[PDB]
Design a protein around this nucleic acid. Structure first.
Ligand code: MG
Ligand code: MG
Ligand code: MG
Ligand code: MG
Ligand code: MG
Ligand code: MG
Ligand code: MG
Ligand code: MG
Ligand code: MG
Ligand code: MG
Ligand code: MG
Ligand code: MG
Ligand code: MG
Ligand code: MG
Ligand code: MG
Ligand code: MG
Ligand code: MG
Ligand code: MG
Ligand code: NA
Lengths: 298, 158, 175
RNA sequence: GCGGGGUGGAGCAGCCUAGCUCGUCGGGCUCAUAACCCGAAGAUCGUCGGUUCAAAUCCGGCCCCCGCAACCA
RNA sequence: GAGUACGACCACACUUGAGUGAAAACACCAUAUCCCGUCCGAUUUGUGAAGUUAAGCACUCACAGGCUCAGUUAGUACUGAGGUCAGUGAUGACUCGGGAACCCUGAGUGCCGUACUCCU
RNA sequence: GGGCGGCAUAUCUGUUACACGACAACGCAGGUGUCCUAAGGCGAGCUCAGUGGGAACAGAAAUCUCACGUAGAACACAAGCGUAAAAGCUUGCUUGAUUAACGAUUUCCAGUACGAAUCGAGACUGCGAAAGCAAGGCCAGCGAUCCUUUGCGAAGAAUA
RNA sequence: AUGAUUAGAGGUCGACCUAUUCUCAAACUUUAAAUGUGCAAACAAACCGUGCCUUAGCCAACUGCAAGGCCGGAAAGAAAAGAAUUAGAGGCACCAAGUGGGCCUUCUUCGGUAAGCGGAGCAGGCGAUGCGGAAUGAACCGC
């Protein structure tokens, strides 16, 4: 026989972790350092750029930490990109850039500092140092840009990861998020340099266009077999040559009307679906009935 | 034999409570400490950086200095015939905002509210009467208080 | 019903091949090359956790080489190993976690051309069965526990072997 | 109380991660024994623990034996 | 009435079984040319959307184990102050005050924010 | 008593110690004069001790694999405390073990030094995508006057 | 939970598991007092007027936070609920003496078989102090 480890004494001495740690959502060691600022600042506002990627769409938020709970200043989602002309690929690197640019324009407009920080109107994947009060820069007296810090969460921070695509879009939108180009696609760990052309290709989905052409040719070689890859891409007449101009148009559309979202039906008592919790007396009555039934059989 | 190091005799003092282990939470990090505030100096054993000496654990003082990660607290300490104002340097995780003036602050705010209500024709709340005054008592049930034989047999074990 | 859900189909998660030479040196170097040819991928050496005077090993000494095979290559190798056993497995060869394994003594029994420089090696073939959805217990974010009903049991693994590979299960217990 | 030692059948090395000699056994040489020649076997390192991946070896406790102290009145 | 992202408190939230699950999500899932990383596209990374609620997830169930708050234990154990109190003593009671703990037993089984979304 | 012995002679952990702090004995149980270019710093991945099932030679114990596992392991050395997407393990890059304008403070305490610490300001940096984290290895591991000895006050500019 | 520990029971003998059970801890603890210990309880203070000035402080900025002031307002000068009391002049110095062998009791307490023995904590006392009592006694009772 094997000794039981999870005995009664095991549960008495157990100390559950934090709820978001048990659920595997929050890394509290990183969260503590991220919401920590100098005590000499006396709680002056500090913001996080939260980038979360699901299997379907991309979530980007501007968040300020509070004791009652984190408050969201502005949010942008990749499923609103169809309102600007991006119907497909709402998860790829190009969509990550557009989600970041959408959040930056939405945040700057809400703070009234739009048209004061235009960012980079035309993207080229080139890294520029971010103006922050931390660095001494040129000691320029010009107004500083809105500042947030990237919050990748539990995401693995590899080179070319989509979390840094949202970063690149946000900085190109006028927000000052401190960063180095080490994790942008096209950056070379050897010789410590960033290739802006490779980075620019991913921003406009050149890699997606090349793969779509490659998949289309393979599907053309054999019509019989059904290809799951790019199924909705090919159902529409999406051409690889039109992808770069579609994202360029979307960037211009985002910069013109950042507040535009998906159209709303705009129509109401809620229909309850919850199961009623049994009262204490009923649970006791049910248990009393069960023992009575067993007693009858004897 | 016995030694006198910095952390001598702190086996139970610098220890977490049962099932309450862990590093300080976000609300401690988000708490704002200002110069002139009242703070309780309670050492957090999971943060072995900037801990107060064991004497200052459980003492309440006034903040005199705020630094990026640290708090300067003035603490009274009796030595021989006088009490010295000792300034200790600790990390922010080892200070809690003191509620030692909560009752006094509420008393001041109640007076302002009462004064404003009295100033402009408002009905003051009724004054509480003392419970030590006399009065007639009507008992619903009356029982006899006595020592019984059962009391003596009930205190015998086995 | 619920058991007919296509997500409950039992698939081969991986096939792990282990050669515990236990001696290091040139003998282990040739065993790694044989595994490299067998599995068509670079294998990884294994060091010794402890030092055993009886076994003639020292701590942190490379005594074994192993490889993890997934997909089509694992299925092809599994058939090769099962041909040697003649598709006959003992009942006790199956774990209660839904996995099983067997050993072959001559690696040239798998149709591999003999090379005088390398020699002859036995190996351990281990198969891990499972269903789709086991990633929830291995992903970094929101890692949780797979449901109890979704686990592959010993009976299901034995049933899978008899049907997919037309094998025979001999009822016995280890001595 | 202080210091030091227990190792093949015996006497002693190695004591800072198993050896010698004698003895024993088999075969030669001799009429035979011894001496001599050729081979072989025999080792919980005093017991109990600990440190270490690994303790005859390093750190404690325990059992015998061995010495040096045990003074001033 | 629900979902997602970030959360505050950190089991009334955990653990073990069982059942149920609108919508939209979330998630399993498909794949490996590119960015990236591995013995292994398992994890991770990129690109996708053919399938599925089977798992995860959310609810509900158990005279469930834990946990939380009460009640009992109990004015008991202990204890501040007092006696030219008792007793050979060990100790004990008494007077003016304070006052536990486990077992056992009753009830309960998360709650509160910001933004967006479904129900609509 | 002294002697012999030992060291309670400087010093660290637990307990004595009586729930702030403080408290003796040649009281109890143990430590210290070292060790480390990493066993310092940082980032990222990972989870340990142990079980249970299974796999050629392989067995109580060699390696592989799946579950469980609140730490029952580890963190140089005594002990206590602390720590689980770490403070442990592996790995990659590094020299924050440098300098630091006589800043302030704690422990011992006479509120004197010494030794250890704590909170900073400046320079130059290391790691990190970033918030940040580091001027050694948290807390024991060490030294006055006088004397000796070493480093710093580079070169070049100034009619002073 | 960590150590110590007696006995049955339930899953040839035992071992091993499951439940509990006899007995414990200065160097064990989930829980946890009494007595304690830190701070506060309106006159250089605090509170109110997004009143005003200044800053090379913080914040992307600002009338927002930080700091130092100025100008005003209000102030049971701290109500009522048991809701303090005081033989309640606070602060600041200077110059110096004796002392640095202690001892005894109440509770707590370590070594020791124990001691009119050795060693501590809190507080009284003798020493330094007689007087009235316990016949007599440095310390007991009263004063
Ligand atoms: Mg991180
Ligand atoms: Mg204690
Ligand atoms: Mg404590
Ligand atoms: Mg499901
Ligand atoms: Mg289901
Ligand atoms: Mg005390
Ligand atoms: Mg104390
Ligand atoms: Mg390390
Ligand atoms: Mg880490
Ligand atoms: Mg010093
Ligand atoms: Mg040190
Ligand atoms: Mg350090
Ligand atoms: Mg370290
Ligand atoms: Mg150290
Ligand atoms: Mg340090
Ligand atoms: Mg205790
Ligand atoms: Mg008076
Ligand atoms: Mg004397
Ligand atoms: Na005298």
């Amino acid at each position: 026989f094997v000794k039981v480890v999870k005995n009664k004494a095991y549960f008495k001495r157990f100390q559950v972790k934090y709820r978001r740690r048990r659920e595997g959502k929050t890394d509290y060691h990183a969260r503590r350092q991220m919401v920590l600022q100098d005590k000499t600042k006396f709680g002056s506002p500090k913001y996080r750029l939260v980038v979360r990627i699901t299997n379907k769409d991309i979530i980007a938020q501007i968040v300020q930490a509070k004791i009652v709970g984190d408050e969201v200043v502005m949010a942008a989602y990749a499923h609103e990109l169809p309102a600007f002309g991006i119907e497909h690929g709402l998860t790829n690197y190009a969509a990550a850039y557009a989600t970041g640019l959408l959040l930056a324009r939405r945040t700057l407009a809400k703070l009234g500092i739009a048209d004061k920080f235009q960012g980079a109107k035309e993207a080229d994947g080139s890294y520029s140092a971010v103006r922050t009060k931390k660095d001494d820069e040129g000691d320029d007296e010009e107004r500083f840009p809105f500042k947030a810090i990237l919050d990748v969460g539990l995401a693995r921070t590899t080179t070319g990861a989509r979390v840094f695509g949202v970063l690149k879009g946000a900085v190109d939108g006028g927000m000052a998020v401190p960063h180095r180009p080490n994790r942008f696609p096209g950056y070379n760990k050897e010789k410590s340099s960033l290739d802006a052309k490779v980075h620019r290709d991913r921003i406009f989905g050149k890699h997606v266009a090349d793969y779509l052409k490659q998949v289309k040719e393979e599907a053309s070689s054999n019509p019989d077999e059904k290809c799951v890859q790019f199924s909705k891409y090919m159902a529409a007449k999406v051409l690889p040559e039109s992808i770069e101009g579609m994202y360029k148009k979307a960037h211009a559309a985002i910069r013109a009307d950042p507040s535009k979202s998906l159209p709303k039906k705009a129509k109401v008592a809620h229909k309850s679906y919850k199961t009623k919790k049994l009262s204490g007396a009923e649970k006791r009555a049910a248990a009393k009935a069960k023992v009575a039934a067993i007693r009858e059989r004897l | 034999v016995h030694s006198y190091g910095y952390k001598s005799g702190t086996r139970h003092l610098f220890a977490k409570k049962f099932r309450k282990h862990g590093v300080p939470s976000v609300s401690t990090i988000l708490t704002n400490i200002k110069v002139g505030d009242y703070v309780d100096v309670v050492a957090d054993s999971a943060v072995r950086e900037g801990m107060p000496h064991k004497y200052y654990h459980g003492r309440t003082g006034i903040v005199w200095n705020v630094t990026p990660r640290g708090v300067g607290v003035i603490i009274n300490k009796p030595v021989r015939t006088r009490t010295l104002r000792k300034r200790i340097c600790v990390r922010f995780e080892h200070v809690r905002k003191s509620r030692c003036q909560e009752a006094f602050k509420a008393k001041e705010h109640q007076f302002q509210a009462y004064l404003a209500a009295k100033k402009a024709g408002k009905a003051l709340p009724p004054l509480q009467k003392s419970s030590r005054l006399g009065g007639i008592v009507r008992p619903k049930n009356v029982e006899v208080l006595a020592r019984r034989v059962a009391d003596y047999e009930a205190m015998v074990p086995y | 019903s619920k058991a007919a859900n296509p997500m409950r189909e039992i698939v081969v998660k991986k096939l792990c091949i282990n050669i515990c030479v236990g001696e290091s040196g040139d003998r282990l170097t040739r065993a790694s090359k044989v595994l490299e040819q067998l599995c068509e991928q670079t294998p990884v050496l294994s060091r010794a956790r402890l030092t055993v005077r009886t076994f003639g090993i020292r701590r942190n000494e490379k005594i074994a080489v192993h490889c993890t095979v997934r997909g089509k290559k694992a299925e092809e190798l599994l058939e090769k190993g099962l041909k040697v056993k003649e598709f006959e497995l003992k009942s006790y060869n199956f774990a209660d976690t839904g996995s099983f394994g067997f050993g072959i003594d001559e690696h040239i029994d798998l149709g591999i051309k003999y090379d005088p420089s390398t020699g002859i090696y036995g190996m351990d073939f281990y198969v891990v069965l499972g269903r789709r959805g086991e990633r929830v217990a291995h992903r970094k974010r929101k890692c949780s526990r797979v449901g109890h009903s979704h686990h592959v049991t010993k009976e299901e693994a034995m049933k899978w072997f008899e049907k997919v590979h037309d094998g025979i299960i001999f009822q016995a217990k280890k001595k």
